Amino acid sequence: IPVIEPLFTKVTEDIPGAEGPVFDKNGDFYIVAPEVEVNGKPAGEILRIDLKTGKKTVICKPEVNGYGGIPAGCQCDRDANQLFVADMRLGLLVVQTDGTFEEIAKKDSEGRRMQGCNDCAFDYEGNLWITAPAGEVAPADYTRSMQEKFGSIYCFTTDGQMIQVDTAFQFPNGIAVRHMNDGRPYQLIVAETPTKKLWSYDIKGPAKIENKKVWGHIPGTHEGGADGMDFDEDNNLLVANWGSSHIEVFGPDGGQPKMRIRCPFEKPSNLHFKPQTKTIFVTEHENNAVWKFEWQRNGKKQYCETLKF
Ligand SMILES: NP(=O)(OC1CCCC1)OC1CCCC1
Ligand SMILES: [Ca+2]
Ligand SMILES: [Ca+2]
Incomplete structure (x- = not known):
């Protein structure tokens, strides 16, 4: 399997558990710091980064009823410049660029308590697919499915329904949606760290998935595995393989990696393309920093880049 070693450029550092890199509709860059703690309790932050200087600005430190959050993944909305943030303690949040936020749901469509979320991905129809590796959201005691299989997958539909679409996962993490050339949602890809x-599912409609199947295999016997992922314009799936110093590259059909990208750090966590460029920003947990490197082609357009009209 061929391995490439592109030039990585440091963007910023000192961001505990650097995760969920994302660009909003104005081109601003945000990342989350899930591991920030105060007095031993979660006090996660959402930050805006100045790409020119690397300076950081905390825009939101989510907390609900005295319970701090552990923000871990992000997606920018299309019709409004707001961020949807998967939080391991608070569930799904909607955050405004001014720092104000709102809790989306405490219970799902079946009346069951919401589970803590890790990452999310919009399909082009506007539905948000979410991974939930943690146990019940606060005030419930914090737990995670690294050992036991209780991680779930949700779909937050355009008509506002929070539906659990599957469960029994051992730490579902990264997630992505493969679309057809005509823009129709085709497959859901989920990483089980x-x-x-x-894993992959065929998407038959909003919150409707079938044919669960082993889609690809992540290399290594190291502790860790697939974390964050995203597609490039040719539908190649780039996956951060936390713990093995590489980002794996899978072809549209999955299976085994077709190529590997060697990183100058052991723990790549998540990534995101800068709109209309070949530039990929990567967060990593060895130095808790953000880097950027040039890929071979542009990234697949995110939902926020599509036009409603
Ligand atoms: N980056 P993440 O999705 O998973 C990595 C840490 C566990 C191994 C891979 O976890 C984040 C949420 C909890 C804090 C960091
Ligand atoms: Ca993650
Ligand atoms: Ca991403």
Whole structure:
């Protein structure tokens, strides 16, 4: 398997558990710091980064009823410049660029308590697919499915329904949606970190998935595995393989990696393309920093880049 070693340029550092890199509709860059703690309690932050200087600005430190959050993944909305943030303690949040936020749901469509979320991905129809590796949201005691299989997958529909679409995952993490050339949602790809597997489902409609299948295999026997992922314009799936110093590159059909990208750090966590460029920003947990490197082609357009009209 071919391995490339592109030039990585440091953007910023000192961001505990650097995760969820994302660009909003104005081109501003944000990342989350899930591991920031105060007096031993979660006090996660959402930050805006100045790409020119690397200076950081905390725009939101989510907390609900005295319970701090652990923000871990982001997606920018299309019809409004707001961020949807997956939080391991608070569930799903909607954050405005001014720092104000709102809790989306405490319970799902079946009346069951919401589970803590890790990452999310919009399909072009506007539905948000979310991974939930944690147990019940605060005030419930914090727990995670790294050992036991209780991680779930949700779909937050355009008509505002929070539906659990599947469960029994051992730490579902990264997630992505493969679209057809005509823009129709085709497959849902979900990373199960410790098992070194990538799973896929056929998307039949909003919150409707079938044919669960082992889609790809993540290399290595190291502790960790697939974390964050995203597609490039040719539908190649780039996956951060936390713990193995590489970002794996899978072809549209999955299976085994077709190429690997060697990183100058052991723990790549998540990534995101800068709109209309080949530039990929990567967060990593060895130095808790953000880097950028040039890929071979542009990234697949995110939902926020599409036009409603
Ligand atoms: N980056 P993440 O999705 O998973 C990595 C840490 C566990 C192994 C891979 O976890 C984030 C949420 C909890 C804090 C960091
Ligand atoms: Ca993650
Ligand atoms: Ca991303």
